[PDB]
């Protein structure tokens, strides 16, 4: 495809995204199983002033997939900014 | 074999020959070493013939590089590029590189199933045969066996691909620099390679004729600059660009900063003063909408000059476009005796594996002869086994960290020698972290390796924090603690305050109960008539479409407008949304100019990195703009349905959370309320969640409608009469009727209740409150008309590239790694339907 032609058909999709996920159901199911099992993040990042996603992670990760990674060999190491700041930037104590 | 051989060949005259029979041809090679006896003087009766000395050394170097078959030219020149040969990487020679030689993991072993995994430092391997031949040419004389690899470099430009055995390349080397230094001779081979026609890898080395050498004629050094940004914000820039002679207008757009990708090339008269420069370069500066185009170039010239003015120009007014900043302090990345290596014992198999024959290398008696200690290992090795340490010890088997890898050899290895080599987290460059990578041999501590690592990690996705349960303060610490949050804080609080009237630090800092507006004087009427010129223009259910402006308090009379709010003003739409896309306005941040990037980023949330992660990661929030359309876009959104007289609506959320119910209840078992209750009751509603699916599921819409799908689920959590049966076991298109009991009973209740409901938390329903229009569903992007008023202008039309925003996002409203293409068009157009997007998918005119 040619630049030109997939910038217009990038605004446009961008801005119904913008638009209409705000609106529509939101399906983390194969999100999880894109930043758990089909994608294979390993280190996943979360920055907010609460770790409002962390605790939940670990409860699919517990719940889904240690079989899992315990087959594949996989350490998951959940991040966030208010408590695992450190971990984030690299300065262990 | 024979190594050595003294003879006399003529009367009074010696011919040792050092005899070197592992070559590229397998067949044995001499060095002649002219040698005039002196019975006359017998204090030193032997002299040395010196002239065409250099001349056989690099016979003798051209028949072991190059084989006896090609004829040995001397005369190469210098100014056109050397043409290599085109190869093809076959499957063997990656199979067969690795015997003793470096890189082994559970992708580099003997192993069945398909392409085994390799390294990119056997591009050398293509490009050696070229890039050696620069040294040769009788412009650049030195001798060979003092002659030193001094350092070696590749660069990352990456439209190739990881070795997949079967790759087809070729080779082409150019002469940069052959400068006169201390220590002699450095030439410059920047010898690039190209995979038919497109360039692949820039592979540069110097090498270093030992010695001091005083021929400056044949001297020069052409260096390509890199898009070197100047620093400036003023008028007098134009100025000071005309000023400068070298200079030519080739552009008509205002000045007020540059980047030039320049390039040079100099000529030495002495050690340090150039006989003369020539500078064409090319020249840079932004262009309007984010949507650049062509541009023009520069020239220059000198003479018997101790700088170059144009490049000089450019670095003093600042640095180039630094991806590079570096981090504060340093911590260990995987230090320790686990990153240990022993040199090999021998060089033979490298030597045969990559072409360099080099007998320094594997010949005691040349060795011997070059007055350096023993048989040093090749440098290339070491470079080889340091970029394949990166991505091994310090990473838990992932092939896809090895990059583009800058080495130098201070030092010298001796073979079966064991290296420290230390890799240290300080540095930081736009993904690929720099690592000190330092080759120290254990016992002597000297160093032999310097170059900067570039390891990767995994994919991942930075998720974020925010709408629904944002708090006071909300990132404020980002505010205090870095100067560019200040900046994007402080200019949207500088634009509410002279556009709308508040600041929204304060809104954020300390939380009010309520605030007002003030509409004083010229600042104050101009800022009451963006609230009396803005406002939503939404069908009144009860006809037509009624172009329409409510914001009603404010006027012309009205001096004051006080926006209130019971629980917190943070809470209110119009002031949690601004706040929201402000304080994730900065992630990337520092890690935007350090290197912390992982393999592959997508940001994301929560269905929150739709309006708090795309600034930082796809700069599609524009600078000042966004507050703007989000304050509006949340009183349009706010004011989109009929308030009561308390100031409460018919519309809103509700859980009816399936996990609390019974672990039975799934996708194939529940998935019928959304289309049971919107049929029959002539209502609007739709699911907002099944994110979580069998543990969460949410909806929005009018409030009955959310009243009766809730007590769906109620009335079967405590009688429990299981959905699987009236779905899979009898039939499913013949029940469409059993629905007319168990809804009848609610589409009544829920009426007989008070129409202002407030659903209660109860088990299987825990509804998320102070939201009144709903939003997450259909009713928040259907016909609501002025949602999208401000959709195909003032935000970047032009900025927005499919390169990263396809990819680099992950659809909350879908799955996987969201297509920003046609291939997701029918996605946001068949759950929530749309229009805008009709005419791309049917109408596509003339986009050829």
Redesign the interface.
């Known amino acids: 495809?040619?630049?030109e032609?997939?910038?217009?058909?990038?605004?446009?999709?961008?801005?119904?995204?913008?638009?209409?996920?705000?609106?529509?159901?939101?399906?983390?199911?194969?999100?999880?199983?894109?930043?758990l099992k089909?994608?294979?993040?390993?280190?996943?990042?979360?920055?907010?002033?609460?770790?409002?996603?962390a605790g939940?992670a670990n409860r699919?990760i517990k719940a889904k997939y240690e079989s899992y990674d315990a087959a594949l060999?996989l350490?998951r190491q959940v991040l966030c900014?208010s408590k695992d700041a450190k971990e984030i930037?690299?300065?262990?104590d | 074999l024979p190594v050595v051989e003294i003879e006399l060949v003529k009367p009074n005259t010696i011919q040792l020959s050092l005899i070197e029979h592992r070559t590229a041809d397998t067949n044995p090679v001499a060095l002649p070493f002219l040698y005039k006896y002196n019975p006359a003087d017998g204090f030193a009766p032997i002299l040395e013939i010196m002239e065409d000395r250099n001349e056989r050394i690099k016979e003798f170097y051209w028949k072991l590089w190059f084989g006896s078959s090609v004829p040995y030219s001397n005369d190469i020149n210098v100014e056109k590029a050397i043409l290599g040969d085109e190869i093809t990487i076959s499957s063997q020679t990656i199979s067969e590189f690795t015997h003793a030689i470096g890189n082994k993991c559970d992708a580099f072993v003997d192993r069945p199933g398909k392409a085994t995994l390799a390294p990119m430092d056997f591009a050398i391997v293509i490009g050696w045969k070229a890039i050696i031949k620069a040294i040769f040419p009788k412009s650049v004389d030195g001798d060979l066996l003092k002659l030193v690899h001094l350092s070696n470099g590749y660069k990352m430009i990456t439209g190739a691909a990881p070795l997949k055995k079967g790759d087809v390349v070729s080779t082409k080397a150019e002469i940069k620099a052959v400068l006169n230094q201390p220590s002699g001779k450095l030439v410059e081979v920047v010898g690039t390679i190209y995979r038919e026609g497109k360039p692949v890898m820039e592979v540069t080395s110097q090498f270093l004729y030992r010695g001091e050498y005083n021929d400056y004629c044949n001297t020069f050094q052409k260096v390509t600059e890199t898009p070197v940004q100047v620093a400036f914000k003023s008028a007098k820039d134009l100025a000071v660009l005309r000023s400068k002679e070298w200079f030519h207008l080739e552009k008509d757009v205002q000045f007020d900063v540059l980047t030039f990708r320049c390039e040079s090339t100099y000529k030495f008269k002495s050690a340090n003063v150039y006989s003369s420069i020539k500078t064409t370069g090319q020249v840079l500066l932004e262009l309007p909408t984010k949507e650049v185009i062509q541009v023009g170039s520069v020239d220059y010239e000198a003479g018997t000059s101790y700088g170059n003015p144009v490049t000089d120009y450019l670095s003093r007014n600042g640095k180039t476009i630094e991806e590079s900043v570096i981090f504060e302090n340093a911590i260990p990345l995987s230090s320790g005796e686990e990153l240990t290596s022993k040199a090999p014992g021998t060089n033979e198999p490298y030597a045969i594996v990559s072409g360099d024959y080099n007998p320094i290398h594997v010949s005691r008696v040349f060795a011997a002869y070059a007055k350096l200690p023993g048989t040093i290992t090749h440098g290339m090795y070491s470079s080889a086994s340091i970029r394949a340490l990166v991505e091994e010890w310090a990473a838990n088997n992932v092939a896809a960290r090895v990059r583009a890898f800058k080495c130098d050899f201070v030092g010298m290895v001796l073979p079966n020698d064991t290296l420290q080599t230390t890799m240290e987290h300080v540095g930081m460059i736009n993904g690929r972290k720099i690592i000190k990578v330092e080759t120290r041999n254990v016992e002597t501590e000297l160093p032999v390796l310097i170059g900067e690592a570039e390891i990767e990690q995994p994919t991942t996705t930075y998720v974020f924090t925010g709408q629904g349960s944002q708090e006071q303060g909300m990132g404020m610490e980002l505010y205090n603690s870095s100067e560019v949050a200040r900046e994007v804080w402080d200019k949207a609080d500088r634009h509410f305050v002279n556009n709308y009237g508040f600041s929204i630090l304060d809104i954020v800092q300390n939380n009010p109960n309520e605030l007002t507006i003030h509409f004083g004087g010229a600042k104050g009427r101009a800022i009451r008539d963006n609230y009396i010129g803005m406002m939503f223009e939404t069908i009144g259910e009860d006809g037509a479409l009624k172009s329409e402006k409510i914001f009603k308090d404010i006027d012309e009379t009205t001096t004051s407008y006080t926006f209130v709010s019971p629980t917190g003003l943070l809470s209110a739409t119009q002031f949690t949304q601004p706040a929201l896309t402000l304080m994730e306005k900065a992630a990337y941040e520092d890690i935007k100019s350090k290197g912390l990037i992982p393999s592959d980023i997508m940001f994301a949330g929560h269905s929150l990195g739709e309006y708090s992660a795309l600034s930082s990661l796809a700069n599609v929030m524009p600078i000042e703009s966004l507050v703007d359309v989000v304050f509006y876009r949340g009183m349009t959104m706010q004011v989109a349905v009929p308030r009561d007289e308390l100031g409460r609506s018919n519309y809103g959320m509700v859980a009816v959370n399936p996990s609390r119910v019974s672990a039975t209840f799934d996708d194939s078992a529940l998935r019928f309320v959304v289309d049971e209750v919107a049929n029959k009751t002539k209502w609007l509603l739709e699911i907002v969640n099944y994110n979580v699916e069998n543990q969460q599921y949410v909806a929005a819409g009018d409030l009955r409608a959310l009243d009766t799908l809730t007590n769906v689920l109620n009335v079967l959590k405590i009688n429990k009469i299981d959905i699987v049966k009236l779905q899979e076991q009898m039939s499913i298109e013949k029940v469409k009727e059993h629905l007319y009991e168990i809804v009848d009973e609610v589409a009544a209740k829920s009426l007989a209740k008070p129409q202002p409901i407030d659903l209660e938390r109860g088990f299987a329903v825990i509804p998320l409150k102070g939201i009144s229009v709903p939003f997450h569903s259909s009713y928040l992007m259907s016909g609501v008309k002025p949602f999208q008023r401000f959709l195909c202008k003032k935000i970047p039309k032009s900025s927005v590239k499919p390169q990263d925003l396809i990819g680099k996002y992950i659809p909350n409203l879908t799955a996987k790694p969201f297509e920003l293409t046609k291939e997701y068009f029918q996605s946001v157009y068949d759950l929530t339907k749309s229009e805008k997007i009709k005419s791309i998918l049917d109408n596509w005119e003339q986009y050829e």
Do not use: C
Not at chain 1, 38 to 51: C, L
Not at chain 1, 89 to 92: A, E, G, N, V
């Open positions: 495809m040619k630049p032609i997939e910038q217009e058909l990038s605004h446009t999709l961008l801005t119904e995204l913008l638009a209409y996920q705000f609106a529509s159901p939101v399906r983390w199911i194969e999100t999880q199983d894109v930043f089909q994608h294979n993040t390993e280190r996943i990042i979360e920055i907010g002033p609460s770790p409002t996603l939940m699919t060999s350490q900014y930037y690299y300065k262990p």
